[PDB]
Amino acid sequence: NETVALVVEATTEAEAKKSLREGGLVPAAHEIMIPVGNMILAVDTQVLDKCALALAASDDPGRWFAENESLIHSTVFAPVAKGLHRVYPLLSVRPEVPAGYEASWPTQDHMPGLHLVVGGTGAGKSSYLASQDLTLVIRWGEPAERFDVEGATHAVSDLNEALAVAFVMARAGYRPAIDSFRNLVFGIESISTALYSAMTAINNVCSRLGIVVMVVVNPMATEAKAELVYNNMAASVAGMTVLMDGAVSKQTVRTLSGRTWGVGK
Amino acid sequence: NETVALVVEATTEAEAKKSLREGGLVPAAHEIMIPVGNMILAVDTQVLDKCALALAASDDPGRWFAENESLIHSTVFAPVAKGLHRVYPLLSVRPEVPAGYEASWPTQDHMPGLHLVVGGTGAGKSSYLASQDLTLVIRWGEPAERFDVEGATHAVSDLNEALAVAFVMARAGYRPAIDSFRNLVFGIEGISTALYSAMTAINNVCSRLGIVVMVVVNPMATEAKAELVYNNMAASVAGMTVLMDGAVSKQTVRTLSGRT
Amino acid sequence: ETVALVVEATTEAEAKKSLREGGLVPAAHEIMIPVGNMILAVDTQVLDKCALALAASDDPGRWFAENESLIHSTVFAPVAKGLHRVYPLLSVRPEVPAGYEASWPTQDHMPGLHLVVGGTGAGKSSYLASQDLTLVIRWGEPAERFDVEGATHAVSDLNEALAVAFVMARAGYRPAIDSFRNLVFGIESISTALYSAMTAINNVCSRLGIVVMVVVNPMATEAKAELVYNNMAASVAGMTVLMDGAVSKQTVRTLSGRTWGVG
Amino acid sequence: PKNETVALVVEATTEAEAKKSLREGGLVPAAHEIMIPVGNMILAVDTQVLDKCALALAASDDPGRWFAENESLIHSTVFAPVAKGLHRVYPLLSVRPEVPAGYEASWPTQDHMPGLHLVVGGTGAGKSSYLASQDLTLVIRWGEPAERFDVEGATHAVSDLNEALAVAFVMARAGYRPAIDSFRNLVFGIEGISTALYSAMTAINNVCSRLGIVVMVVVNPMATEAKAELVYNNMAASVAGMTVLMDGAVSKQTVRTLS
Amino acid sequence: ETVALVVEATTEAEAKKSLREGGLVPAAHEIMIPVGNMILAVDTQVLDKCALALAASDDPGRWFAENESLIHSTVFAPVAKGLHRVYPLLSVRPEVPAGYEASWPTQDHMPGLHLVVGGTGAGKSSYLASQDLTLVIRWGEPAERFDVEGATHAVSDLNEALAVAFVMARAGYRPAIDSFRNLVFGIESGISTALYSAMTAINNVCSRLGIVVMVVVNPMATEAKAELVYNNMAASVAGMTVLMDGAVSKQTVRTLSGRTWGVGK
Amino acid sequence: ETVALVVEATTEAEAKKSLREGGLVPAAHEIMIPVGNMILAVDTQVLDKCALALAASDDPGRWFAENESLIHSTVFAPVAKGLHRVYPLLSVRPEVPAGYEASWPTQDHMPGLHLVVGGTGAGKSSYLASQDLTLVIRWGEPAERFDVEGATHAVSDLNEALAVAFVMARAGYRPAIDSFRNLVFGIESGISTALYSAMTAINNVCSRLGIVVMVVVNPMATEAKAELVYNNMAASVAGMTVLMDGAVSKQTVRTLSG
């Protein structure tokens, strides 16, 4: 099979042992669960590898995503079965790196995971992305602007599509950025500590996949409370770059050999 | 004759695959989902264009409007299926612009989206609207005034109707405004962040439709935080005009040659 | 024709019926009133039957006690659960009947609510006595001498209170509600849901072309008191503020413009 | 039998069943049923059972013995209807402010409106002490730790709000003088104090008003002693009479009268 | 005669059965105990049966271990869901059995709870060693030396902590419970007022049973709010002892004849 | 045997079955573990089968690698929904098995948790490297160099973290969990008292099993409230080591000598 169950979930033990795609409660070997707030998502790494080969084969990345909505919705989806929260208590994603992983981008020996580009409104976050040699920017949760008609972009509607597009692109060897996680900052309630654990979750999926995804985050903190929040975000992900008035004031990165620190301002 | 499912929703995988209109969980090509707070509405762009074309092509567009209010209103509805929050997590609306879009109103090269007219009580908002040469003010969630009885006005009850009339009018080439988003401010909960993403969602529906809709918003903000609210609201929408004691005190707009 | 109380629509055919019958679609003579997380409905045809029957008798007070079953049919709470989803952020549309005229509470007073506001001891009873009311509808306040002696009708819930005021005002009589205390206490997180609830009730009055005077003690701090009063004023046709027995402030939306009285 | 028991679990699922009494599992009160909203709860008093009890007590040769023998019947005066749509059907429910014809009173003060008479104050203010002066028939003891008095006084101990209201209503209709010590579980159980406490007391006050009785009730609102005056004013704004105690003396008495 | 665990009344005839059988009406020998948003029940008929068996046993500690089943039948949580509606604002009624006498914990001590109160390190558990207790019931505390060498009985939940105390006291023994830490932590609403009503409820069951149960309680109050919290606690129970630096700094007890007070440093 | 995932007890006869089978009554070898509003269960028979196979194995290393799935199944979450009601305010019995003795982490250390506590940067992972551990179990932390090179086992949820720690320690090895970060974040209400009772619960399971498990906890407290928090945590567990600026600033331990 290749479709995702949307409304029929397991009611018997036999059904409960099937894959998340088929409405059961047990991930198949190629399914990875991604907890985000009170939601649970799943990535199917077989469909992901099939999409990554197809993408790298085509003569247009932007055009490929627009005409393959259906495989994108098989790549990352929200399992229908309701007992997942109970069966996997305090679920995270396990910190694990594929063998032979290498990276020169965003920085040398960058651990796979998330690289956050953070700062208040107007810090220069989008001007920062435009100098990182992205293949395209995945646009999510932000009001349409000039860049959306002129730049190398692909617009998405929900977190499944944002993650899926970033995953397929990076597995095909391209460089994605997501602009932005605004809806995750606003959507996760009761700043919430669940935001930090969602970021570790999404980080460690990129880590298991051997990729780095650049992600813009405006955390909506006070000056007073900006330092707290930035230290907690840093402790949650592979890399974080703080922007202030166009320039990097602070950077922290986990690498394959240790850690690197950046102080500007 | 194929109406909107109000109570029966998909129980099987095969029903789950149908359109939101029919009670499934998968948008049809012409359905756009609109997340507002914890609500999910849907615009049917085929019903939308049907209505907008009948309006823009009429010899008497005012009469066609009057005779088809119910049809116009059915353009936006609330899907019945319950798992939509799960299937489309942290839903927003795609930021994209139709090919060949151009605009002169409310300013030159205005990005499609919302244009917010903001301010506190008495700042002169209704006086600013009378100067924008609008076709129609859609009146929602405000107490009946003299305007509601003798102005170029159309009164609605809920958000479905308010967006529907704004969408149809603007697609038919007219200039609509909504007075006001009062019930979003009060109904969604120094103010609720869900208000900002609701405005981005509605902004991007307009952006996808290549239209501009002008909307009145009283954020009901203390004078301290009022500057920070207005900045958060500007970062959510295409354009915003602040009023302070009868005068335009600020205007920021994103355009097709760069955000002024 | 009776109001459905437990059986609601479970099929699309049933859902097309009126609110009275358990459906999700208002008949032409049904108007929905959103109040907090509640949705009520007024049946304008039952309202008009009641308003004619009440104008026939000589005793407005006695008619209401002997017809509890008709007013519970005038304003009721629909049983169907999906109304919140189907009518998102519901309000009531601001519209006016053709040929509406009013000399009371003020000249050309827009139809809607007239709020009489003030804290405890602010002069409320005195002010209603000066407005030549048919009778005061009493709701959610402790019984006092006035309930024994004065021209009153005592109700229990918000349906009854709106029903009685509606039938009275359409029958030409002149009602006041004392008070919206349970609406101030029952709608909270005071909640901005209180302001939209009064806009809703206000525009129901304007669609029926009536004015209903209503006592409200929003009961907030002096500091935040004037901010609350302005928000209430922005929600309704008219508002009168009492303090120390005297009218401190009045705002009225009129058939021409806006009236600002300040004492 | 079948005329006197309350639906505990089965509620109306048809329109014919919904039209029956609250006792029977329906959603429309009988002529003799008064709904009492307390917080998010809805109780009901059956005035017909209440008057059975009050008359048999007031007319008995030995009212003490009749009480002792009919406690379970007395307690069944107030109950909690089983039907779920009541909150929807009766939005923002209160109780009708209304006084029977020919009501007169001398206690607790001359011409005291029917309703609640609150005895309020902080921990140790002398509240239970002040009851000994009001020359009472019975103190109904609810939600308080057992003490001497619960062994040697004119007391009736109860477990829940139904029983407490039931005994106070029956006693006061029989012409006696009851007091509830106390509404502590009202204050705790209803979420500086909740406005729902104020509307609860108005509701219970207006039941007493409709029955032409006065019931004396002890209430410690647990207020900070900065905000206490504001609280005491809101409580007095909700009931017929209020008496505050500080350090063992009456420091304020406000009472609504038939004049 | 066993405890219904999952099947509750669905007919009126079933609803009139006892709490044990899944009904909504206590038998004559059943007392409901409301605790927070929970409702427990003691079966005084099974209680008396156990107190006779325990009294005729050599080893109290060893008897309790071999009788988990009789204990779970002595205090339990009824399965029927409508109890909160049927019994609004439920408490336990204050009444005292005929012919009740007490010399312990003090002379003429009212039946009820005797609270041993303090902050961390106050000497609470050392005070217990001087009250000359049959056995300490250990609940919700990390295991320590005393659990290996001491006269203890370890339990897991509030039912068995109350049951074991009830059976011991009714058989003439002296129970202390160390501690009510999980009430303080478990009961929500500077501490929750529902804690005070829970203590009154448990107090008055003890009262109705004609027993005294000693209970260690750390209310976790800021030193600001300590005298207020202690005063609310004192007003909720028969007796309370406050410890500071190993010594009794405050005491209050309701007796059969009046009130007693103690003041230390 | 296999664990009931979706079908729970509907009759009194089913309700009396084990937690594994969808019932509401623990078997003799099932210990319930309340953690926040969750209730887990450890099956000590599966636990001891796994521990024995590890401890008896010629190459314990490859037995672990080949049997991860089964080890993880040592701890599960019962499907029966009435557990909270039936076991009000659930904790774990404070008991110690007979003949328990311990040389590590300190001499005569009570069985239970040994918390390694501090703020970000305090030096905790470096203190783990000095404790002579068999395995660091990595849970809820972003992937690091350590997760590529070190003596490490990565897990996804609290069931797996507890199961690997229980099985390793029962087999005679020294496990540590890095870290309880998702307990701190996930059990909410300067922090929820529920975190403290969760640690006592897990602590007493370790006590009943006669083991010590070392756990890293960053409670994310303000500098002011820090000492108060650290005091509350030490009151909840067997042992606690506080780290500041790379060094051990405090260590309290409950002992058999006591």
- Residues F112 and F109: their CA atoms lie apart, in Å, by 9
- Residues B40 and B160: their CA atoms lie apart, in Å, by 11
Angle of CA points A52, A54, A55, to nearest 5°: 65
Instruction: Choose among E82, E189, E200: nearest Cβ to D9.
Output: E82
Q: How far is A204 from chain F (nearest CA, A)?
A: 6
| Contact between chains at D38 and E110 (C-beta distance less than 8 A) | no
Report whether B204 contacts B213 (CB < 8 A). Answer: no
- Residues C145 and D209: their CA atoms lie apart, in Å, by 11
Q: Output the six-digit token pair for E96.
A: 């005292």
- Residues C47 and C162: their CA atoms lie apart, in Å, by 11
Report whether E196 contacts E113 (CB < 8 A). Answer: no
Report whether E90 contacts E200 (CB < 8 A). Answer: no
**Positive or negative CA dihedral for D87, D91, D96, D97?**
positive
Local structure of residue D175 (DSSP, 8 states): T
Report whether F105 contacts F205 (CB < 8 A). Answer: no
What CA dihedral angle connects F240, F243, F247 and F252, to 10 degrees? -20
| Helices E226-234 & E193-208 angle (0-180, nearest 10) | 30
| Contact between chains at B256 and A41 (C-beta distance less than 8 A) | no
Q: What are residue C31's DSSP bridge partners?
A: C42
Provide the experimental method for this PDB entry.
Answer: X-ray
- Between residues 76 and 115 of chain F, which touch chain E (CB distance below 8 Å)? 82, 85-96, 110-112
Total residue count of chain A as it appears in this document: 265
Neighbouring CB atoms inside 10 A of B115's CB total: 24
The Cβ-side half-sphere exposure at D38, using a 13 Å CA radius, reads 28
**DSSP three-state, residue F68:** helix
Q: Output the six-digit token pair for A123.
A: 């810090």
Query: What is chain C's alpha carbon radius of gyration, rounded to the nearest angstrom?
Result: 18
Total residue count of chain E as it appears in this document: 265
- Residues B9 and B22: their CA atoms lie apart, in Å, by 8
Q: How far is D32 from chain C (nearest CA, A)?
A: 15
Report whether C158 contacts D102 (CB < 8 A). Answer: no
Nearest to D152 by CA among B72, E100, A68, B126: E100
Which residues precede chain breaks (C–N over 2.5 Å) in chain B? 189
What phi and psi values does residue E106 have, to the nearest 5 degrees?
-140, 170
Cβ contacts of residue B204 below 8 Å, gap of 6+? Answer: A143, A144, B92, B93, B94, B95, B96, B113
Cβ contacts of residue D250 below 8 Å, gap of 6+? Answer: D130, D243, D244
Q: What are residue E249's DSSP bridge partners?
A: none
- Residues E188 and F197: their CA atoms lie apart, in Å, by 14
- Residues B229 and B234: their CA atoms lie apart, in Å, by 9
- Residues D22 and D37: their CA atoms lie apart, in Å, by 14
Report whether F6 contacts A12 (CB < 8 A). Answer: yes
- Residues B96 and B238: their CA atoms lie apart, in Å, by 12
What phi and psi values does residue B17 have, to the nearest 5 degrees?
-80, -10
What is the β-pairing status of strands B247-253 and F175-178?
unpaired
Query: Is residue B186 less than 8 Å (CB to CB) from chain C?
Result: yes
Local structure of residue F109 (DSSP, 8 states): B
Nearest to C236 by CA among C257, C212, C261: C212
Indicate the helix (H) or strand (E) that contains A44: strand A39-44
Domain ranges of chain D: 1-259
Angle of CA points A44, A47, A51, to nearest 5°: 135
- Residues E178 and E216: their CA atoms lie apart, in Å, by 5
Query: Is residue F140 less than 8 Å (CB to CB) from chain A?
Result: yes
Cβ contacts of residue D157 below 8 Å, gap of 6+? Answer: D140, D141, D142, D150, E93, E94, E95
Nearest to B39 by CA among C87, A192, A188, A160: C87
**DSSP three-state, residue C85:** helix
| Helices C158-170 & C192-207 angle (0-180, nearest 10) | 30
- Residues D36 and D34: their CA atoms lie apart, in Å, by 6
Report whether C36 contacts C197 (CB < 8 A). Answer: yes
Question: From start to end of B21-85, where are the E strands?
Answer: 31-36, 39-44, 76-77
Question: From start to end of B49-175, where are the E strands?
Answer: 76-77, 113-118, 136-139, 153-155
What phi and psi values does residue C33 have, to the nearest 5 degrees?
-120, 105
CA distances from B174 to B62, B108, B168, E204 (A): 12, 16, 9, 74
| Contact between chains at B203 and A8 (C-beta distance less than 8 A) | no
Instruction: Choose among A7, A144, A185: nearest Cβ to B111.
Output: A144
- Residues A21 and A74: their CA atoms lie apart, in Å, by 8
What is the β-pairing status of strands F112-117 and F212-217?
parallel
Angle of CA points C186, C189, C195, to nearest 5°: 70
Nearest to C169 by CA among C54, C58, C72, C252: C54
Query: What is chain D's alpha carbon radius of gyration, rounded to the nearest angstrom?
Result: 18
- Residues D62 and D58: their CA atoms lie apart, in Å, by 9
**DSSP three-state, residue E42:** strand
Mutate to test the interface with E, among D42, D159, D163 (most CBs of E within 10 A): D159
Q: What is the stated resolution of the deposited model, in angstroms?
A: 2.4
CA distances from C76 to C51, D14, D17, D20 (A): 17, 18, 19, 18
Distance of CA F256 to the CA centre of its chain: 21
- How many H helices and E strands in chain D? 11, 10
What is the β-pairing status of strands A39-44 and A31-36?
antiparallel
Contact yes or no, F with D (3+ CB pairs under 8 Å): no
**Subunits adjacent to chain E (3 or more Cβ pairs under 8 Å):** D, F
What CA dihedral angle connects C192, C193, C198 and C199, to 10 degrees? 80
| Helices A45-57 & A159-171 angle (0-180, nearest 10) | 60
Cis amide prior to F105 (ω within 30 degrees): yes
What phi and psi values does residue D88 have, to the nearest 5 degrees?
-65, -50
Residue E49, exposed/middle/buried by CB under 10 A (0-12, 13-18, 19+)? middle
Cis amide prior to A106 (ω within 30 degrees): yes
- Residues B45 and C164: their CA atoms lie apart, in Å, by 45
What is the β-pairing status of strands C152-154 and C135-138?
parallel
Distance of CA B66 to the CA centre of its chain: 21
Report whether D231 contacts D219 (CB < 8 A). Answer: no
Report whether A250 contacts A230 (CB < 8 A). Answer: yes
Q: What are residue C241's DSSP bridge partners?
A: C117, C249
b vs e for D189-220, b when ≥16 Cβ sit within 10 Å of the residue's Cβ?
A: bbeebbbbbbbbbbbbbbbbbbbbbbbbbbbb
**DSSP three-state, residue E88:** coil
Nearest to E180 by CA among E153, E200, E161: E161
Report whether C180 contacts C114 (CB < 8 A). Answer: no
Cβ contacts of residue D166 below 8 Å, gap of 6+? Answer: D45, D74, D75, D76, D77, D78
Q: Output the six-digit token pair for A134.
A: 């992205």
**DSSP three-state, residue F239:** strand
**DSSP three-state, residue C251:** strand
- Residues D68 and D53: their CA atoms lie apart, in Å, by 12
Contact yes or no, B with E (3+ CB pairs under 8 Å): no
CA distances from E228 to B191, E247, E253 (A): 35, 20, 17
Neighbouring CB atoms inside 10 A of B225's CB total: 13
- Residues F249 and F258: their CA atoms lie apart, in Å, by 21
Local structure of residue F3 (DSSP, 8 states): P
Nearest to B161 by CA among B138, B145, B180, B183: B138
Report whether A167 contacts A46 (CB < 8 A). Answer: no
CA distances from C113 to B122, C30, C239, C251, F82 (A): 21, 20, 8, 12, 50
- Residues D145 and D161: their CA atoms lie apart, in Å, by 16
Cβ contacts of residue C72 below 8 Å, gap of 6+? Answer: C3, C159, C160, C163
Distance of CA E191 to the CA centre of its chain: 19
Residue F2, exposed/middle/buried by CB under 10 A (0-12, 13-18, 19+)? exposed
**DSSP three-state, residue A251:** strand
Instruction: Choose among D8, D157, D188: nearest Cβ to E197.
Output: D188
Nearest to A211 by CA among A202, A219, A223, A198: A202
**Subunits adjacent to chain C (3 or more Cβ pairs under 8 Å):** B, D
Total residue count of chain B as it appears in this document: 260
Helices (H), D117-160: 127-131, 149-152
b vs e for C48-83, b when ≥16 Cβ sit within 10 Å of the residue's Cβ?
A: bebbeebeeeeebeebbeebeebbbbbbbbbbbeeb
CA distances from F253 to F117, F125, F250 (A): 13, 20, 10
Instruction: Choose among D19, D96, D113: nearest Cβ to C155.
Output: D96
**Positive or negative CA dihedral for E247, E249, E254, E259?**
positive
Nearest to B48 by CA among B77, B6, B19, B24: B77
- Residues B167 and D195: their CA atoms lie apart, in Å, by 43
Instruction: Choose among D5, D10, D145: nearest Cβ to E11.
Output: D10
| Contact between chains at F193 and E77 (C-beta distance less than 8 A) | no
Q: Output the six-digit token pair for E68.
A: 């988990």
Look-up of token digits 């009268």: D257
- Residues F220 and D181: their CA atoms lie apart, in Å, by 46
Total residue count of chain F as it appears in this document: 258
CA distances from F136 to E223, F110, F154 (A): 40, 21, 8
Neighbouring CB atoms inside 10 A of B229's CB total: 19
| Contact between chains at C77 and D89 (C-beta distance less than 8 A) | yes
CA distances from A137 to A162, B8, E28 (A): 10, 40, 73
Report whether B13 contacts A6 (CB < 8 A). Answer: yes
Distance of CA D166 to the CA centre of its chain: 7
Nearest to C90 by CA among C19, C8, C5, C167: C19
- Residues E30 and E35: their CA atoms lie apart, in Å, by 16
Report whether E224 contacts E259 (CB < 8 A). Answer: no
Report whether C261 contacts C247 (CB < 8 A). Answer: yes
Cβ contacts of residue C139 below 8 Å, gap of 6+? Answer: C154, C155, C156, C157, C158, C160, C161, C177, C178, C179, C180, C181, C182, D94
Report whether F208 contacts E147 (CB < 8 A). Answer: no
Amino acid in position D127: K
Report whether C184 contacts C156 (CB < 8 A). Answer: no
Q: Output the six-digit token pair for F198.
A: 């969760």
Report whether C216 contacts C117 (CB < 8 A). Answer: yes
- Residues A54 and A174: their CA atoms lie apart, in Å, by 13
Task: For chain E, give the longest Cα–Cα distance.
Answer: 60
Query: What is chain B's alpha carbon radius of gyration, rounded to the nearest angstrom?
Result: 18
Look-up of token digits 């000693």: E214
Nearest to B75 by CA among B60, B54, B99: B54
Query: What is chain F's alpha carbon radius of gyration, rounded to the nearest angstrom?
Result: 18
Q: How far is A99 from chain F (nearest CA, A)?
A: 9
Q: Output the six-digit token pair for F126.
A: 């470096």
